Design a protein around this ligand. Sequence first.
Ligand code: SAH
Lengths: 455, 448
Amino acid sequence: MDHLPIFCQLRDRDCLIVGGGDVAERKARLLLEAGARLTVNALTFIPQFTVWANEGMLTLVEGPFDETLLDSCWLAIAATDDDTVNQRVSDAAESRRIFCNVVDAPKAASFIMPSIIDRSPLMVAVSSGGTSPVLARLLREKLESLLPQHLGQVARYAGQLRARVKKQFATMGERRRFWEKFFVNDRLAQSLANADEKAVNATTERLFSEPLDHRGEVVLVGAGPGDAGLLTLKGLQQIQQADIVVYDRLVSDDIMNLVRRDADRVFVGKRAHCVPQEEINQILLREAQKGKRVVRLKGGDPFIFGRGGEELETLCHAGIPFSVVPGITAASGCSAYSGIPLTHRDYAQSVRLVTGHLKTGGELDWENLAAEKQTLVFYMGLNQAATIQEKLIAFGMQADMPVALVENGTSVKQRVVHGVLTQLGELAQQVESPALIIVGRVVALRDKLNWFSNH
Amino acid sequence: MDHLPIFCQLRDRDCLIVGGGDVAERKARLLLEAGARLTVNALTFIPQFTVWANEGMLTLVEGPFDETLLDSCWLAIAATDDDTVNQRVSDAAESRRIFCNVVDAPKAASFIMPSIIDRSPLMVAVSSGGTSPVLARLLREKLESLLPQHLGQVARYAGQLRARVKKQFATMGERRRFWEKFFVNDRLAQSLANADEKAVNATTERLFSEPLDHRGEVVLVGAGPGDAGLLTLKGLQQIQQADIVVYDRLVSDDIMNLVRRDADRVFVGKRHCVPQEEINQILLREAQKGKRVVRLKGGDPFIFGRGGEELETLCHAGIPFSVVPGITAASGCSAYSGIPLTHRDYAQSVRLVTGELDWENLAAEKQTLVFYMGLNQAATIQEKLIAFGMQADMPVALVENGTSVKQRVVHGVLTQLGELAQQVESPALIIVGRVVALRDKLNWFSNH
Ligand SMILES: Nc1ncnc2c1ncn2[C@@H]1O[C@H](CSCC[C@H](N)C(=O)O)[C@@H](O)[C@H]1O
């Protein structure tokens, strides 16, 4: 260990920053967030410093480094781009035993400012010890994704439950298991941040009312179109806490590798037999009743041609809490990765997400669809490519209207094919499921916005 | 934040610990490992202290607490079994502006000792401030298994190569590209751990003899509707390593907090609003400089904003670019309000929208409508929808600040539409369709 980390209380304590440029501004913003009684000393100050001063957030001392300025300070930071001046601040700081930091010379002075993850009162700090700030940022990025947004809320709330916990659970091992469950309760944390007192009370009582070992709930998570990088921070957080994961085939392999090493997995997709929806709905409810934290992982988004509503309406008089985490829908993913915006200046503003045929029980609206400037996007329509081609130009759609097909969008094997409407059914026998059909003038923009490799 | 973490260099610097029991022993052990010049003042001492004292690792002062023992100290730690003496230590330290910790009283004094995970020279610290000590213990455990055992070797080597990297590459973009390839090389890491210098040098020479691109780039990133948890993994990565970020007012402040702290930021808004051409210009200019530029937009860049416009000239300019999709307001707002955009017979068509609009096409059904920027045209929407064939009774819903902790949802029917719209402000979304009916058979986020 070459540095000792300490967490300093700065509320209303004198700190000094020398310098007034952009580097000095970051430092000031940070010290201010911690509540320091801050003085900034420099020859000139950028606009943001005048603003803070004009609203009573700090004190400005315009001029060259005034050493007496350190006389009653607890912390100093040399943030100028003149090494000689920074050196003098460092020397003056050290003479009076004031911990001091010199921005681009991390080990020349008293302390190093680490990269921080803020979930106050909970906080994590990472330091290179001066070797690799790049590595420190990489770690911050990883830690920011692993720590839910409102973790601080429950850290702060634990105090108001400690007593009741010791009262109901008399064994050390029991109270620990309680906190383990308490600290990963995202619904409670959110409710506290929402200032929703009834939900806070409801979720709190349930934590004491249910058996210690039960953590019953259902979470619908949108996995995105395939690229593991498109999963949401909350989705990953949810998936890492699951006891059981119920997924289908349109959930990528890269995504499943992110699922908690030994959470049970239940595949309910098309096996090389169709699992009926009511059986899927029933497994979610059943295992949540058994006390397991259930995550229903869905391809793309849960409420868009995903039948997510059905898997939830079966949960209201079961007394099983639930929640939804949206995901990037196939339309959004394929759009961005194919260089085809769904909306562009004139071409635009009506975007229609429509279903094709595997999914039926009535029949399709040709001119309502064949109608003017709206971008059309068909889900599950590869088996009616030609049947869509004929019924579109028949109702007025101009045969030279651009179209495109995107197979396995956002994945390393993404295939994009394109042309005009009179080639639809033909370009389709050049792709396989899963794929989307995009009809509209926005398709031509790809000649300028294409950035992802084709296969 | 209620505490600011800092990493102190304690070598040859005086520190003082008051107390000589087990609590004081663990404290002394860390300070010694940090290389501090330690003095321990206590009425009584346990064996280990004597061990350290005759090995010349510290100085012992036997007897009651002496206020003058703090006169040349940088840090003070009170660890006696007497609460009264412990605060005589903190009061004495404060008079001298010396950071001080009282072990059994975290809400007191001036600093707290966090839990540590050691991978020297790399180090990670975590603390609750005393609010949730079990929370921090649990996290330290998780972090110990998450961080590779030999990560310190890679970090150490990186520091040693720093001087050569700068002299071999001129631009920031190749030096940045070097480190990205560096920390991703599993052979290098495994080689350092197996102290096989041959393998280390072989791989190292190849990284240095590589032609790395020097140009910057523009990356469009979807921030989503507001909730920071809805940012994508890749979106977080991009804002975490960007050189500069261009953002508007629809990027929540929580998401803005996830941005690299030492990156520049340009507000593109209602301060009017850097008329697109102006924004479009900022992008290519900053990228021309070799910077990694991130245009952070609300929701999804290819559905709501002028994302296409912001990139359609970059190919001509020879500037690399990419797009990271985000959760659309339509998807987030609807889902957080308990309204799914589609259900079994309900919809087979979803429509996102915005003088004119084709009312007969937006009024026919078996569909779910979503209006994006339509609060001041709201009265005319129902009128046109009702006139072109839509069923009064049809449910409608407006969502304000959807997905945020301040979310609000009003509900009603086409006829009350123009009214409900004065029951809320911007930014707000309007959902028309049947699916708005199962809102409280599925409502999960808030009660308002
Ligand atoms: N990676 C992908 N690339 C192209 N289309 C995809 C896709 N993933 C899903 N799809 C489309 O989605 C259809 C199944 S319906 C499920 C859609 C999903 N809930 C979503 O929100 O995206 C497929 O037939 C296909 O048309």
